[PDB]
Structure 1
């Protein structure tokens, strides 16, 4: 019954082996392959990478911050890792909305994709349209109607909530393991408040790339041998998604390999 982390790893080797040098926005070098996909069970397990230690706390507090729907950087650097622009959280909860500061009442503003997604699951779980999208701030002023950076399609069958994430770009060494843990968490959350059981998380990349300064660390991480994934426990019963707080989650069974810094 093979390991899903064996996917991520394999993706790495491929981008290393058959990957092709490509320059990013900043003219920084990368090894790039176009179009990938990985499937990760959420059934009795949780995709917190083992081949290296993943900042689980920052993943949690970061998510909740998105769900709190905020634009306030200090509301995070004191919960783990002064106006911020409308990063994902603000989109998730009010896209279409006129963006003042971090402080004002946008209560009842724009479209609340995230509530909408939840709702749609309860109302019509066969729906092929349960989709949040998420922009890069850089893009907002840059042009009319810029393209999402990411989008999840959620999906439900036999009482099992699944989520597929599509990123136009994937930082494989630094970003990817994180998002895997994030959208896997998100899912778990939604599954929970909709009385559903977590299913698969599918991870689709456009440009999957590695930064040249990551190759070495990653070559070493490859030689590592994934311990079995942990589990994720919720310990209160929670009805509204804004009610979740960090207390509600226990990770259990997480013995990673040591941290691997990638700059």
Structure 2
């Protein structure tokens, strides 16, 4: 049912979610363990049509993850300011990272993907050949042994959590191949269904399409498995309004080229075709 899976999850949380408080104390409606499956066949990419998704933000954040970058200032340079708050002096101080420079998020997401286990210094440091390159290893495995049942990429490193501005949310992904098609399952421990989740869906779906082009496979499915899937009490009314919007068909991703190395992908190499969101 495509987008209707997302909209039915919103509906389910509104109707059956339990009243649960978050870190600050801000209330949520919550359910545990829901799953959503999106077809990536016929170039489809699940970018929501009932709300306009910040596609440029999705792309730049992903490429920044793929490069193994952790400097929020590098995103701020591209006019993507989604990570600036968690890289602020006041926020880093609140986490006990007083020595850490402004915008230096620590060994978050991408650093774990490309350099798992490497000793973190700063965001500007040279990490070439440091730690375990999980992403490069998955790409080599998809080319040489696509039936492998261990194609895991994790950002969940218990030893580095204290060094991160925030612990990973979209924490573990698994890759799978069947009938020349690449599928991805993301385990996400916590999901703000109203804000973060639509962005995570577009992000990992883009990652799967990009990875498929790297290894001569076709995109299959993207599965999002959530832990605590919740709606903030402040979002209920705006989400109720979004539920009345009739979805339009999902856009198609057009990849113009794939470079030799996945970290050399630029926003110019691919684009959304027929993206018609509600205004």
Please confirm whether the aligned pair reaches a TM-score higher than 0.5, indicating the same fold.
yes
Q: What is the match of residue 111 of structure 1?
A: 132
My pick for the range that moved more, 236-245 or 133-142, is 133-142
Q: What is the match of residue 172 of structure 2?
A: 151
Per-residue displacement from partner, 1:120-140 (whole Å, max 9, x unpaired)? 111211011101112499971
What RMSD over aligned residues (CA atoms) do the two structures have, in Å? Answer: 2.0
Give 1:141 shift: 1.7
Q: What is the match of residue 204 of structure 1?
A: 225
Give 1:150 shift: 1.6
Over 3 Å counting, the alpha-carbon distance change for 1:75 and 1:229 in structure 2 is: same
1:253 matched to 2:274:
yes
Structure 2 distance, partners of 1:41, 1:182, is 14
Structure 2 distance, partners of 1:221, 1:137, is 38
Over 3 Å counting, the alpha-carbon distance change for 1:106 and 1:147 in structure 2 is: closer
Per-residue displacement from partner, 1:156-183 (whole Å, max 9, x unpaired)? 0111000011111111000100000000
Structure 1 distance, partners of 2:258, 2:19, is 48
Give 1:237 shift: 3.8
Structure 1 distance, partners of 2:36, 2:200, is 13
**Poorly superposed stretches of 4+, deviation over 3 Å:** 135-139, 146-149
Q: Secondary structure of the residue that 2:24 maps to in structure 1?
A: coil
Q: What is the match of residue 91 of structure 2?
A: none
The 5-angstrom pairing of residues 3-18 of structure 1 reads 3-18=1-16
Aligned residues: 254
The 5-angstrom pairing of residues 205-224 of structure 1 reads 205-224=226-245
Q: Is the Cα–Cα contact under 8 Å of residues 169 and 190 in structure 2 kept in the other structure?
A: no
Specify every segment of 5 or more residues in structure 2 that has no aligned partner in the other structure, as ranges: 81-101
Q: Is the Cα–Cα contact under 8 Å of residues 169 and 206 in structure 1 kept in the other structure?
A: yes
Give 1:148 shift: 7.4
Per-residue displacement from partner, 1:192-232 (whole Å, max 9, x unpaired)? 00000000001101111000011010000001110001100
- Higher helix proportion (structure 1 or 2): 2
Q: Is the Cα–Cα contact under 8 Å of residues 160 and 198 in structure 1 kept in the other structure?
A: yes
Q: Is the Cα–Cα contact under 8 Å of residues 57 and 80 in structure 1 kept in the other structure?
A: no
Q: What is the match of residue 26 of structure 1?
A: 24
Per-residue displacement from partner, 1:228-257 (whole Å, max 9, x unpaired)? 011001112423202211100110110101
1:58 matched to 2:57:
yes
Q: Is the Cα–Cα contact under 8 Å of residues 107 and 160 in structure 2 kept in the other structure?
A: no
Q: Secondary structure of the residue that 1:84 maps to in structure 2?
A: coil
Specify every segment of 5 or more residues in structure 1 that has no aligned partner in the other structure, as ranges: 259-263
Q: What is the match of residue 79 of structure 2?
A: 80
